[PDB]
Structure 1
């Protein structure tokens, strides 16, 4: 569909970052809280993006 599903949109060029409501953090104990799995995966993705940008230039 030209308006809604264009074929080139199947390739990701910009990634949407969900709000913390989607990936809430949990307090494992009284002091240390735990980052969610999605948060760690997004951190890894962003590190890889930074690495690619640094290497390219």
Structure 2
């Protein structure tokens, strides 16, 4: 839960995200990427 990943407010009108948010987002991006390739066109050396 985001009690573990807090989001800081920078110049009051800007706010970044603690690392685990961006990293989970990147893992999920890579998940949606891994889905498509092995569901249709698969050049083998693009899956692994």
TM-score strictly above 0.5: yes
Question: Does residue 3 of structure 2 align to residue 21 of structure 1?
Answer: yes
Question: Whole-Å Cα distance in 1 between the matches of residues 33 and 10 of structure 2?
Answer: 31
Question: Does residue 18 of structure 2 align to residue 36 of structure 1?
Answer: yes
- TM-score (norm: length of structure 1): 0.64
- TM-score (norm: length of structure 2): 0.74
Gaps of 5+ in 1: 1-18
Question: Whole-Å Cα distance in 1 between the matches of residues 25 and 34 of structure 2?
Answer: 14
Query: Post-superposition, which runs of at least 4 consecutive aligned residues in structure 1 deviate over 2 A?
Result: none
Aligned to 2:35: 53
Query: How many residues are treated as equivalent by the alignment?
Result: 39
What is the RMSD of the two structures over their aligned residues, measured on CA atoms? 0.7
More strand by share: 1
